[PDB]
Write a protein that binds this ligand. Structure first.
Ligand SMILES: CCCCCCC/C=C\CCCCCC(=O)OC[C@@H](O)CO
Ligand SMILES: CCCCCCC/C=C\CCCCCC(=O)OC[C@@H](O)CO
Ligand SMILES: CCCCCCC/C=C\CCCCCC(=O)OC[C@H](O)CO
Ligand SMILES: CCCCCCC/C=C\CCCCCC(=O)OC[C@H](O)CO
Ligand SMILES: CCCCCCC/C=C\CCCCCC(=O)OC[C@H](O)CO
Ligand SMILES: [Ca+2]
Length: 418
């Protein structure tokens, strides 16, 4: 198929991102994604654009109310080897791994993929140079002049069981403001990961699991503030994520998860953070729909954060699925921030209890708009669908007096493909 058009109508309700402390969303929008694909022997090329119009600045994809954008544009060469799962891709492209915790984003990259039955491997380099959007003229400061280089290798050591290692390096080439006029880093994540159909919603096994452990090292120049100077320090942090899923039958599943990113230490030196390319969204509940690993509402980054998780899920053939997820969150170090949550409000010193969340995702998949698993737009939308995604967050003692007791973020997406 050489071209198509994705049409999405989205409503978003958000209340209240700052828990009532500062001066919400209740809005609707349309999202149009024309795409083009060509293939000629070992060569191929792809483009997807995006046009959005909304009643306010809503999230239509996991600024002005309306804008145009270039989502993906790449050329691909598959001829280095005869293995069909092996190819080299150049351009702004979808980078993804199954957990979503290392990379899950569209970014300018050169990425080599090698995927066979017994051995998987990948290697790439990436950097943002623009938003390619009509409404945003500049890059985020964290992204400006930051280069990513990464790789992984893994093998299937038994049927349905994979073991692997993964590396990522981020280098900041920018400079901090001189005194009188938030950080630059060189950071390396080195991870091991074991999975037993962790993200395979079609598993034939009665039990599935994931386990991963990641060591973060390198250093950060933190700007102190008008700037007054800089603090440098080595980083030596550690992250872990574990989960177990019971495949009760063809339809019912349930499971438990635990994750922890280290925190604090002298000037935040024992503070884990993620690569900045992660989405934290995955099929961990065992359905075709991806779920935010740390809540649709809270949207935690694994950083001075401990989370315990429980979920249940239901699906009927390829027609429906649904998931219900509960999370409880604690800070690891009670005098340090958690960073990168879906909540913009200050924490009270000495309190670890971040809060609790309940999530619900419900999807009906329509017969029209079926895609090949090859496309990058198949992970989120395998065909037309209608989906509700909602999260209810109850702030704990760490947020303290005069904050709302409850906050929610909910979405409906209706998607039709031509
Ligand atoms: C401006 C208000 C116009 C749109 C009003 C409501 C549409 C949003 C519905 C919330 C989506 C469901 C979550
Ligand atoms: C939540 C954890 C759920 C565990 C389900 C265990 C199997 C239930 C027994 C069904 C027969
Ligand atoms: C530096 C990155 C380079 C990325 C190249 C981006 C190209 C984006 C889309 C190219 C679309 C390719 C199909 C269109 C085309 O070339 O014509 C082919 C015929 O129409 C069909 O055989
Ligand atoms: C493949 C394993 C699947 C297991 C999933 C759920 C695992 C839940 C707990 C395992 C151990 C986690 C420790 C929980 C805990 O409170 O530890 C204390 C922290 O280390 C304090 O920082
Ligand atoms: C089967 C469980 C159903 C609920 C699961 C997760 C909840 C998902 C969406 C909650 C719907 C909106 C709740 C409204 C609410 O509690 O807060 C209102 C304001 O946001 C309070 O600031
Ligand atoms: Ca507000």
């Amino acid at each position: 198929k050489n071209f198509g058009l994705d049409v999405k109508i989205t409503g978003e309700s958000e209340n209240d991102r700052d828990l009532g402390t500062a001066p919400t969303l209740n809005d609707i929008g349309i999202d149009l994604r024309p795409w083009a694909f060509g293939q000629w022997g070992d060569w191929s090329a792809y483009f997807m654009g995006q046009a959005v119009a909304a009643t306010d600045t809503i999230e239509t994809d996991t600024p002005d109310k309306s804008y145009l954008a270039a989502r993906e544009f790449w050329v691909d060469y598959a001829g280095l080897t005869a293995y069909p799962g092996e190819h080299l891709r150049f351009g702004r492209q979808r980078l993804r791994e199954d957990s979503g915790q290392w990379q899950d984003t569209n970014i300018e990259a050169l990425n080599w993929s090698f995927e066979t039955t017994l051995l998987n491997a990948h290697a790439g380099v990436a950097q943002r140079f623009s938003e390619y959007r009509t409404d945003l003229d500049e890059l985020a400061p964290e992204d400006k002049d930051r280069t990513h280089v990464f790789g992984d290798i893994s093998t299937q050591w038994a049927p349905h069981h994979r073991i692997g290692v993964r590396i990522h390096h981020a280098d900041d080439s920018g400079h901090l403001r001189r005194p009188g006029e938030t950080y630059t880093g060189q950071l390396t994540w080195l991870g091991i990961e074991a999975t037993g159909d962790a993200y395979n919603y079609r598993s034939s096994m009665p039990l599935n699991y994931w386990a991963s452990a990641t060591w973060l090292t390198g250093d950060r120049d933190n700007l102190t503030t008008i700037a007054t100077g800089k603090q440098s320090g080595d980083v030596n942090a550690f992250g872990v994520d574990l989960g177990l899923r019971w495949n009760i039958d063809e339809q019912w599943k349930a499971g438990v998860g635990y994750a922890r990113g280290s925190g604090g230490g002298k000037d935040g030196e024992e503070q884990f953070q993620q690569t900045g390319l992660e989405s934290n969204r995955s099929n961990f509940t065992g359905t075709r729909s991806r779920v935010h690993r740390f809540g649709e509402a809270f949207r935690g980054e694994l950083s001075n954060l401990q989370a315990a998780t429980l979920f249940g899920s239901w699906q009927l053939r390829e027609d429906y699925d649904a998931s219900l997820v509960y999370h409880k969150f604690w800070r690891v170090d009670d005098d340090s921030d958690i960073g990168t949550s879906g909540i913009n409000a200050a924490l009270q010193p000495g309190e670890k209890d971040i809060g609790q969340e309940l999530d619900l995702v419900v999807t009906k998949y329509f017969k029209q708009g079926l895609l090949p698993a090859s496309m990058s737009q198949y992970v989120d939308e395998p065909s037309a669908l209608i989906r509700f995604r909602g999260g209810l967050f109850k702030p704990g003692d760490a947020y303290g007096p005069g904050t709302d007791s409850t906050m929610h973020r909910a979405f409906v997406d209706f998607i039709w493909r031509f």
